[PDB]
Amino acid sequence: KPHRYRPGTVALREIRRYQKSTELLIRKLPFQRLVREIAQDFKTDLRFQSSAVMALQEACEAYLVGLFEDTNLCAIHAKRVTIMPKDIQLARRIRGE
Amino acid sequence: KPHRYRPGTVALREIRRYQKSTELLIRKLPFQRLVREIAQDFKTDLRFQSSAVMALQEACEAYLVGLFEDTNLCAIHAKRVTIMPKDIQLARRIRGE
Amino acid sequence: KVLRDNIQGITKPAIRRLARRGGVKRISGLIYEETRGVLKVFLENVIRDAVTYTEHAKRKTVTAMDVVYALKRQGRTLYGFGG
Amino acid sequence: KVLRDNIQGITKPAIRRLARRGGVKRISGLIYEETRGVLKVFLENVIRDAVTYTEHAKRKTVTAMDVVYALKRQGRTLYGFGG
Amino acid sequence: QPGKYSQLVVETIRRLGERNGSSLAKIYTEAKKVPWFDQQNGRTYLKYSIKALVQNDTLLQVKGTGANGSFKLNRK
Amino acid sequence: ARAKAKTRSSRAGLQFPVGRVHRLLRKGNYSERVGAGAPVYLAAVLEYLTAEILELAGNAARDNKKTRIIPRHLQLAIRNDEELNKLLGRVTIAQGGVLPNIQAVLLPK
Amino acid sequence: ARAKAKTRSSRAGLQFPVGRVHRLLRKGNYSERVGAGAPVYLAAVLEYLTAEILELAGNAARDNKKTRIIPRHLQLAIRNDEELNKLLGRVTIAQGGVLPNIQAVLLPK
Amino acid sequence: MDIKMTQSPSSMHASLGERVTITCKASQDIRSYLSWYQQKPWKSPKTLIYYATSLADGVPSRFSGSGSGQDFSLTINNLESDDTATYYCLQHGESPYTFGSGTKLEIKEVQLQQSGPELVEPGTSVKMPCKASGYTFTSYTIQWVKQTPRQGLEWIGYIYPYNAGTKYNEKFKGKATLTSDKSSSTVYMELSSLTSEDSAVYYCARKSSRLRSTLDYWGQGTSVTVS
Amino acid sequence: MDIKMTQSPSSMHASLGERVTITCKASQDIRSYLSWYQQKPWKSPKTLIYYATSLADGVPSRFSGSGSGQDFSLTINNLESDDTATYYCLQHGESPYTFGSGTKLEIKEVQLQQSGPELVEPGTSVKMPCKASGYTFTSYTIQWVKQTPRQGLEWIGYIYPYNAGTKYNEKFKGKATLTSDKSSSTVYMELSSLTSEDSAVYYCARKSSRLRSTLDYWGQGTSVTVS
Amino acid sequence: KRSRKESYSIYVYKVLKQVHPDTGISSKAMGIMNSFVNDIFERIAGEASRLAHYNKRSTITSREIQTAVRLLLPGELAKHAVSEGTKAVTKYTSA
Amino acid sequence: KRSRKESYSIYVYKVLKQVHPDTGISSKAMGIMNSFVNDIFERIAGEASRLAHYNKRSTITSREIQTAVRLLLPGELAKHAVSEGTKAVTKYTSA
DNA sequence: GGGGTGGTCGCTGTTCAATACATGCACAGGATGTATATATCTGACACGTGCCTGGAGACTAGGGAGTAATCCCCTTGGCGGTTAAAACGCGGGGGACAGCGCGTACGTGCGTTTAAGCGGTGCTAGAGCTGTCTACGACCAATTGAGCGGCCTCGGCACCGGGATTCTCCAGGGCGGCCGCGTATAGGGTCCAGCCC
DNA sequence: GGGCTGGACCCTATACGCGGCCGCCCTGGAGAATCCCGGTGCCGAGGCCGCTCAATTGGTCGTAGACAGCTCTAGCACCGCTTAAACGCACGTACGCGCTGTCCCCCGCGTTTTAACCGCCAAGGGGATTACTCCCTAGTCTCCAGGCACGTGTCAGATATATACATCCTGTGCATGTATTGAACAGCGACCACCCC
């Protein structure tokens, strides 16, 4: 019979995996394309340095990780374990955004 | 038997009253004594300007109001209406304090 | 002379009024001590900087300008007191 | 030439990975679109300032120094790319 | 054909009264003083008894379902 | 003959003191040099922002049937605006109070 | 004849460049004048802070059995310290990762 | 008490390339808070001049506004065939915003998605949605404007999605009531007790909370017809 | 591989007013992370010098230290009556902090509240409380130190209340266990399987996470006795 | 004896008499407006100084101040401040 | 050749060779340490400049730097930085 | 030697112990993941070399800051009343919270698709650097008028008294669903007449 | 010739609707709060006058940046190949949300206490100003060595492989409860041994 980990076990293994690692979690080429798609609104035909796209990726990933930490805290405050858009909205509202 | 408002009616009247008013909510003389006691730890025999103590009271009251707003939002997030020390701790820890 | 217990001067009704202005309908009984602790922490943080500015100016009187500078240094910019 | 719908490039598993690093055990299905919106807002705020710096320098290339300056201006100081 | 906890709950309902039925919570509280009552899973046996006696229609559910709500004896 | 003095504020059409702004820019240790148009441009920006806040506060005072702008009116004007509230989000206004705001779930019924 | 030059870093017993710090203060538009001891004090403070962070990061690398300090070790050193974390609360470390932490409620029964 | 705007020239005829000047008179001082709009028939109005002198985004310098106080003017220097349209002044200095009677001229990415035409019977209600896209929804008020072919343009009222604040024209209290949905970037106007008088095209119009800002982007307009 | 710390003069006699030098030799290079302590009999040790040269807060300039690398020294110039006590060096350059043997010298607001004496039978467990007050609890590690008349002072381990981090002396792993309570600002030390060897005074001591910082304030010392 | 203490009170009041001729202003509102003017001045001046330092420029120009304004003022505040400043600078240059 | 861009890398590496004789540092951590030094220099210098401006003093001295250190650095990090600065200034003065 | 009754055997109703069902806990073992040890290698890092520019040495100018002295103002300390607010107490209701039930939304795994990553090539826009020159900002001296301090008055607003409107709470009445008691019904017990043994 | 059976009259157990009762909902009225309106007075804003200092004007000069031109870097575009990850889908389970019930603990109002606030007065410390001076830093010129660009090699970590341990998941067995059924046992109908007349 096929082996199956019960729900949440692979989730905890994955949390431990990614909290130990340091590499970028967002696909690099898609994030670059997203940056260019946004930037074309402000100024056309913008060139981007490789290190500039990388710095944007580092900053966005750190911001999202911090936001999810606060979202998890809000969800646990609501005695839940599932983070929800209302949790994210609460975190953003409290941070002052 | 005398007239009596059901719980929360007078609380809502106070909420509206104190959101209309701008006067100071903490008594000036004991807040002044608190400021002097706290400052006594950093330098003995300090003088304070009246305007310095007023500015401290303004800042403290506004900070406490801003913190209670986030505390109330966390309580509402928990489906509650009573604000609790866990709510204050959540708001503070999300704000980064 | 020596001040010893003035944090209790932030009375329960005063904390209740601050909560009412903050929009709080119902208040747990431990909120009072938690808020007193938070207020003590904030006051220590601000007054330490104010006293530092006063010491730098070699003054003895903590001024509203010193308080405003401390608040601004903490990101609590306060308008109305000579800033 | 043009780019139109690249916010879908922040895939559901990528958002899951970001949440996992953030310590999230279980994720609602609407987190993906909520986080895509939040990320787009943040990127717009950062890139607007970085492009403003680039325009001021009369450069046509957006540089990592401009990105670092925008981030620092937004209170999100980034170490590793300055200089 | 009774059982220890079955008879326990059927007599606790009489002893407690509660015209609008006795809930599982208050039956548990009033039964916990019983000498033989098992602390670890006595509540589990009380829930078993409640469900089985509802299956036997000797108990009546006033509102709710399962072990929720309040229970009163079906008259005869 | 020496021409009669004509303030740079009047030359720019501004109310705010372009000369004072230039003095502050020179004395503030902001740069080695200060271009002639920089204090004019900055005085115009400060005049614009001051006029906007004062006009919103005057509207709020008129709605409250008060003749004189008060810190309550300033706070109302600033917080009732998304852009001004983003500009001065970190700012505390003395005696400004707070906006009337009660969460819907607290209201009865 | 000029005496044999002695670097101000050597005079102050510091490894950070006192002369470079002084030149950055003077060219940085901070004040009209810069005291002679100000660059020495600032270089000393910067050297102390750098030594503190580098030593904590080297300890973290040693526990991780790494002989070279990496951004992961810098992040660990900064975040495992309350004073350094409060100094660098708003700061992001590239390739630093995050502290391993799982909320107690998420752990299995 | 509402400020009457008096566009003196009701209509003009002109050839290509020659200058055309349209003027407005106010009943009270509005302190330059006046805008000019161009409306080609069956199209939504586009702003040309705001703050009585400044050019709108992307409008050519051919349009030149002037004046202050109570006397205002609009100038078109180099006419083109496309310039055949109706021009309305709009004061927004005082609470009831007022459009001019309109001047007809004959020559010989912010999006507001607004619903299509809605047929309705008298006495019932109709709810018209506004779907705002391409910008920060909460930062701008949504202005609702009613256009009859007999009374010209009328400003109904606005909602500020930032704090859900509303302000209504006294002619439209009760008749109109505005609601907002931040989660869908949608603003709803409902009309109560529809009457044959209410047969008109309704335009949503974005306007920044800035006082000098004008109604810059317009929805395509929802035609409401009462039987 | 423990850094054995050798105070050369175990005991000495001195009159009032003359200079006294106490010498420390470290087994390995500790890079100037050495501190000196003064322990009057039956009272907690007070810190005197840290970073091998710096006077602790409130200590008169009479005490002075020198040396670096492996050789260290303590110097007392103006001997007064209250200088009679036992002096202990403490290296904290490497993970096991090591005290010296202790030179007995005889001649002719932060508060850590620690529980009173304990009488315990062998094999039982004990939980000494540490109550910290007068400072920010999380910013400073709490260091636990065991003092016996036969082995002298011994560092057991520390708790970092900021992140509940721990480090223990290898001699005490399993034996000792540390926990903290942010709410009550209290730190607890569990001792499992008490033995006759555990009849000792245990001191809680505050130490900032700064590497050059040393044990600055000490508890009164819970005298634990095993029957 | 006393000394001069400059403030923006008179200029705030003269702008008030343009935006609302009949409306007055209390002294505390004058103090708050003074603090606001000073705060925004220091923000724009500091941002312009940082821009000049980033570009290695030694002078602060109207282009420096314009970029600082666009960085600091959000939304349409930036657009209208830029328009007002540009109009003032153009008039000053012409006169 | 490329223009000589100053950096703190060699000074940070000398500090590393003192605090950990055998440990090295990657180039990315080197860049992070350079950014850290630049950031802390900017903070302390800005705070000292603001102190001098508040006191109407033209010059920045070791006293302004000391006050800026006490204001910015927390806890005993501040007191250790102050002790280090005082030691360095005394040694420099003794020449 | 027949009529008749209790004893005892067979058939059956009652209950009672074994059967079966369902749920909860401990453990062996199997599948999987994770750290640990060993060997290869590669490219990043540590160190050496040239040089060049920026920091050190030596000296002067001058002005900013330190120090002494004086004023006066504004902070502290005290005292006497006066309520307004705080402290405390009690009744109660309503909200926190624990528990259970249910359904569905999210977690895990497998097979398929896709497009990211990597390498390699080619090109050109533009970042960076140098050289020229002019406009512009700093600096100085004389001038003077704008803006600050002091004086004053007078009107906007804060407060007080009084109705008037609004909003809250609840007590009483209208209305409907749940429960107690009486009824048409038929099942069965019993009375009257014909019939079979 | 008389009891059995059939049919019919009467005693009685029963399913069901109407009246009584408990709860839900509606509405008018008491009363408490807040708002609109008028009157009073007071002190703070707004205006006027004197003055002083810094903002303006006119002119000089030096240097920073605007602009032009060149170079050579790296950013962009494209193509091919591999494979890792993303996606679609099935399945199931555990978690979120709703409902009910308990009870505790916070709200509302009344009563007593106390200390905050305000008015008035006095001392006196210290912040601000002014004059004098001196020494500390800016500025200049010379020059030389530290630090940056570049080159080079080697070893520390990245990767691949194998292994040994740890963790999790689950099927099995055991212990607890529950409801369930064939049979062990006793009560009564009926056959037979035996008493009485």
Q: Map out the domains of chain C as residue ranges.
A: 1-83
Instruction: Say yes or no: Cβ of A1 under 7 A from any atom of strand L.
Output: no
C-alpha H203/C-alpha J1 separation (Å) is 66
C-alpha G68/C-alpha G47 separation (Å) is 20
**Cross-strand bridge partners of residue I5:** I26
Domains in chain B: how many in total?
Answer: 1
Note the Cα J46 to chain centre separation in Å.
13
Contact yes or no for B68/C24 (Cβ under 8 A):
yes
C-alpha H96/C-alpha H114 separation (Å) is 23
C-alpha E24/C-alpha E66 separation (Å) is 10
CATH number at residue A81: 1.10.20.10
Q: How many CB atoms lie within 10 A of CB J17?
A: 15
C-alpha K73/C-alpha K50 separation (Å) is 16
Helix (H, G, I), strand (E, B) or coil at I146: strand
Q: Is residue A5 part of a domain?
A: no
For domain I5-107, say whether CATH 1.10.3720.10 is its number: no
**Greatest Cα-to-Cα distance within chain E, rounded to the nearest angstrom:** 33
D80 interfaces chain K, CB cutoff of 8 Å: yes
C-alpha J89/C-alpha F41 separation (Å) is 6
What tokens does C65 get? 């300008």
Q: Any idea what the Cα angle at residue E20 is, between residues E19 and E21, rounded to 5°?
A: 90
What tokens does H37 get? 């709009």
Positive or negative: CA dihedral B36, B39, B44, B47: negative
Residue from G25, K35, K10, F24 nearest J53 by CA: G25
Residue from I80, I113, I109, I119 nearest I219 by CA: I113
C-alpha K19/C-alpha K13 separation (Å) is 10
**Greatest Cα-to-Cα distance within chain C, rounded to the nearest angstrom:** 47
Residue from H216, H219, H221 nearest H36 by CA: H216
What are the residues whose beta carbons fall under 8 Å from the beta carbon of H115, sequence distance 6 or more? H128, H129, H222
Tell me the shortest Cα–Cα distance from D80 to chain K, in angstroms.
4
Residue from A84, A4, A20 nearest D24 by CA: A84
Closest residue in chain C to residue K47, using alpha carbons only: C73
What tokens does K21 get? 């004789």
What are the residues whose beta carbons fall under 8 Å from the beta carbon of H182, sequence distance 6 or more? H137, H138, H161
Helix and strand element counts for chain C (H, E):
3, 3
The CATH classification of domain H112-219, taken from the options 2.40.30.10, 2.30.38.10, 1.20.1600.10, 2.60.40.10: 2.60.40.10
Burial degree of F36 (CB within 10 A; 0-12, 13-18, 19+): middle
Q: How many alpha carbons fall within 13 Å on the CB side of residue K23?
A: 25
**Cross-strand bridge partners of residue G68:** K24
Instruction: Say yes or no: Cβ of B84 under 7 A from any atom of strand L.
Output: yes
CB-CB: which of G12, G34, G61 is closest to K23?
Answer: G61
Task: Give chains near J: 3+ CB pairs under 8 A.
Answer: C, D, F, G, H
Please judge whether K54 and C53 are an interchain contact, meaning their C-beta atoms are less than 8 angstroms apart.
yes
C-alpha I200/C-alpha I216 separation (Å) is 21
Q: Is residue A23 part of a domain?
A: yes
Residue J76 phi, psi dihedral angles, 5° rounding: -80, -15
**Cross-strand bridge partners of residue H97:** none
DSSP E strand boundaries for I134-185: 140-148, 152-160, 165-168, 176-181
Residue from F32, G10, C69, G11 nearest K68 by CA: C69
Task: Give chains near G: 3+ CB pairs under 8 A.
Answer: A, D, F, I, J, K
Q: How many CB atoms lie within 10 A of CB H40?
A: 13
Tell me the shortest Cα–Cα distance from K6 to chain I, in angstroms.
30
Please judge whether B74 and A73 are an interchain contact, meaning their C-beta atoms are less than 8 angstroms apart.
no
Q: Which H, E and C letters describe chain A, residue by residue?
A: CCCCCCCCHHHHHHHHHHHHCCCCCCCHHHHHHHHHHHHHHHCCCCEECHHHHHHHHHHHHHHHHHHHHHHHHHHHHCCCCEECHHHHHHHHHHHCC
Residue from A63, A61, A34, A64 nearest A48 by CA: A34
DSSP character at residue F28: T
Q: Is residue B83 part of a domain?
A: yes
Residue H114 phi, psi dihedral angles, 5° rounding: -120, 145
Residue indicated by tokens 């990127």: D43
Tell me the shortest Cα–Cα distance from K90 to chain D, in angstroms.
33
- Return the domain boundaries, chain I: 5-107, 111-215
Residue from A59, G71, K32 nearest D66 by CA: A59
C81 interfaces chain F, CB cutoff of 8 Å: yes
Residue indicated by tokens 């030359």: F11
Q: How many CB atoms lie within 10 A of CB H169?
A: 20
Q: Is residue B81 part of a domain?
A: yes
Residue from C22, C27, C1 nearest C12 by CA: C27
- Rounded to a whole number of angstroms, the CA Rg of chain E reads 11
Q: Is residue A8 part of a domain?
A: no
Nucleotides of M strand lying within 7 Å of any protein CB atom:
31-34, 44-46, 53-58, 64-66, 74-77, 85-87, 92-103, 105-110, 115-117, 125-130, 136-138, 142-150, 156-158, 168-171, 176-181
Interface test with H, best of F75, F78, F81 (most H CBs within 10 A): F81
Contact yes or no for J40/F12 (Cβ under 8 A):
no
What tokens does F65 get? 């049937």
Closest residue in chain D to residue G95, using alpha carbons only: D80
Instruction: Say yes or no: Cβ of C29 under 7 A from any atom of strand M.
Output: yes
C-alpha I38/C-alpha D53 separation (Å) is 60
C-alpha F88/C-alpha G51 separation (Å) is 39
C-alpha B30/C-alpha H158 separation (Å) is 47
Please judge whether G28 and J49 are an interchain contact, meaning their C-beta atoms are less than 8 angstroms apart.
no
Q: Which fold has domain I111-215?
A: Immunoglobulin-like (2.60.40)
Burial degree of B3 (CB within 10 A; 0-12, 13-18, 19+): exposed
C-alpha K87/C-alpha K81 separation (Å) is 10
C-alpha B16/C-alpha B34 separation (Å) is 29
Nucleotides of L strand lying within 7 Å of any protein CB atom:
17, 23-25, 31-35, 44-47, 53-58, 64-66, 74-76, 85-87, 92-97, 99-102, 105-110, 115-117, 125-130, 136-138, 143-150, 156-158, 168-171
Measured in angstroms, what separates residue K32's CA from nucleotide M160's C1'? 32
Characterize F77-88 residue by residue with b for buried, 16 or more Cβ atoms within 10 angstroms of its Cβ, and e for exposed: bbbbbbbbbbbb
What tokens does F26 get? 């020179």
- Helical pair B50-77 and C64-73, crossing angle rounded to 10 deg: 30
Burial degree of D12 (CB within 10 A; 0-12, 13-18, 19+): middle
- Rounded to a whole number of angstroms, the CA Rg of chain C reads 15
Contact yes or no for H202/H189 (Cβ under 8 A):
yes
Q: How many CB atoms lie within 10 A of CB I191?
A: 23
Please judge whether I210 and G83 are an interchain contact, meaning their C-beta atoms are less than 8 angstroms apart.
yes
- Gaps after residue numbers in chain H (C–N over 2.5 angstroms): 108
DSSP string spanning E22-62?
EEHHHHHHHHTTSTT--TTTHHHHHHHHHHHHHHTTSEEES
What are the residues whose beta carbons fall under 8 Å from the beta carbon of J70, sequence distance 6 or more? D52, J78, J82
CA distances from D19 to A26, B78, J48 (A): 12, 21, 38
Contact yes or no for B78/A57 (Cβ under 8 A):
no
Positive or negative: CA dihedral J63, F12, J5, J33: negative
Question: Which residues of chain G between 70 and 109 are close to nucleic strand L, CB under 7 A?
Answer: none
Q: How many alpha carbons fall within 13 Å on the CB side of residue B54?
A: 13
Contact yes or no for G74/G93 (Cβ under 8 A):
yes
| Contacts made by residues A86-92, CB under 8 angstroms, sequence distance 24+ | A86/B77, A87/B77, A88/D31, A88/D34, A88/D35, A88/D38, A89/D34, A90/B73, A90/B74, A90/B77, A91/A67, A91/B94, A92/A67, A92/D38
Residue from I16, I39, I163, I177 nearest I102 by CA: I39
- Beta strand A82-83 with D26-27 is parallel
C-alpha F32/C-alpha J56 separation (Å) is 11
Contact yes or no for I30/I72 (Cβ under 8 A):
no
Residue E61 phi, psi dihedral angles, 5° rounding: -90, 115
Name chain J contacts of G28, Cβ cutoff 8 Å: 53
C-alpha F109/C-alpha G22 separation (Å) is 68
DSSP string spanning K26-58?
-HHHHHHHHHHHHHHHHHHHHHHHHHHHHTT-S
Tell me the shortest Cα–Cα distance from G54 to chain I, in angstroms.
11
Taking the alpha carbons at both ends of chain A, their separation in whole angstroms is: 50
Characterize E15-35 residue by residue with b for buried, 16 or more Cβ atoms within 10 angstroms of its Cβ, and e for exposed: ebeeeebbbbeebbebbeeee
Can chain K be said to touch chain E, i.e. do they have 3 or more Cβ pairs within 8 angstroms?
A: no
C-alpha H75/C-alpha A16 separation (Å) is 69
Q: Domain limits at B34?
A: 15-97
Name chain B contacts of C21, Cβ cutoff 8 Å: 15, 18-19, 25, 65, 68
Residue I155 phi, psi dihedral angles, 5° rounding: -85, 125
Question: Which residues of chain A between 25 and 84 are close to nucleic strand M, CB under 7 A?
Answer: 27, 36, 47-51, 75, 78-82, 84
Characterize H190-200 residue by residue with b for buried, 16 or more Cβ atoms within 10 angstroms of its Cβ, and e for exposed: ebeebeeebbb
C-alpha B88/C-alpha B70 separation (Å) is 8
Q: Which H, E and C letters describe chain H, residue by residue?
A: CCCCEEECCCEEEECCCCCEEEEEEECCCCCCCEEEEEECCCCCCEEEEECCCEECCCCCCCEEEEEECCEEEEEECCCCHHHCCEEEEEECCCCCCEECCCEEEEECCCEEEECCCEEECCCCCEEEEEEEECCCHHHEEEEEEEEECCCEEEEEEEEECCCCEEEECHHHECCEEEEEEHHHCEEEEEECCCCHHHCEEEEEEEEECCCCCCEEEECCCEEEEEC
C-alpha I202/C-alpha I221 separation (Å) is 5
What are the residues whose beta carbons fall under 8 Å from the beta carbon of J4, sequence distance 6 or more? none
List helix spans (H) across chain I.
Answer: none
Name chain C contacts of J25, Cβ cutoff 8 Å: none
What tokens does H4 get? 């009457």
For residue J88, the surrounding DSSP H or E stretch is helix J76-94
For residue G93, the surrounding DSSP H or E stretch is strand G92-93
Tell me the shortest Cα–Cα distance from C78 to chain J, in angstroms.
8
Name chain H contacts of J88, Cβ cutoff 8 Å: none
Question: Which residues of chain E between 36 and 65 are close to nucleic strand L, CB under 7 A?
Answer: 40-41, 43-44, 47, 51, 65
C-alpha A51/C-alpha K33 separation (Å) is 17
Interface test with G, best of F25, F26, F29 (most G CBs within 10 A): F29
DSSP character at residue D48: H
Contact yes or no for H31/J21 (Cβ under 8 A):
no
Positive or negative: CA dihedral H102, H104, H105, H109: positive
DSSP string spanning C29-63?
TTHHHHHHHHHHHHHHHHHHHHHHHHHHTT-SEEP
Question: How many residues belong to chain K?
Answer: 95
Q: Is residue B36 part of a domain?
A: yes
What are the residues whose beta carbons fall under 8 Å from the beta carbon of I106, sequence distance 6 or more? I13, I14, I84
C-alpha I146/C-alpha I221 separation (Å) is 9
Instruction: Say yes or no: Cβ of F64 under 7 A from any atom of strand L.
Output: no
CB pairs under 8 A between C and K: 20
Domain made up of K2-95: CATH architecture? Orthogonal Bundle (1.10)
Closest residue in chain H to residue J74, using alpha carbons only: H139
CA–C1' nearest nucleotide, residue J60: L137
Contact yes or no for G82/I161 (Cβ under 8 A):
no
Q: How many alpha carbons fall within 13 Å on the CB side of residue K88?
A: 32
Closest residue in chain F to residue J16, using alpha carbons only: F54
C-alpha G6/C-alpha K92 separation (Å) is 12
Tell me the shortest Cα–Cα distance from F50 to chain H, in angstroms.
13
C-alpha B18/C-alpha F101 separation (Å) is 11
Residue indicated by tokens 């009047």: F10
**Residue I12 amino acid letter:** M
**Cross-strand bridge partners of residue C61:** B47
Q: How many alpha carbons fall within 13 Å on the CB side of residue I172?
A: 22
What tokens does I183 get? 């709410």
Please judge whether C80 and F106 are an interchain contact, meaning their C-beta atoms are less than 8 angstroms apart.
no
Taking the alpha carbons at both ends of chain C, their separation in whole angstroms is: 33
C-alpha A8/C-alpha A37 separation (Å) is 36
Helix (H, G, I), strand (E, B) or coil at G108: coil
F28 interfaces chain G, CB cutoff of 8 Å: no
Closest residue in chain G to residue D20, using alpha carbons only: G102
Q: How many CB atoms lie within 10 A of CB G20?
A: 16
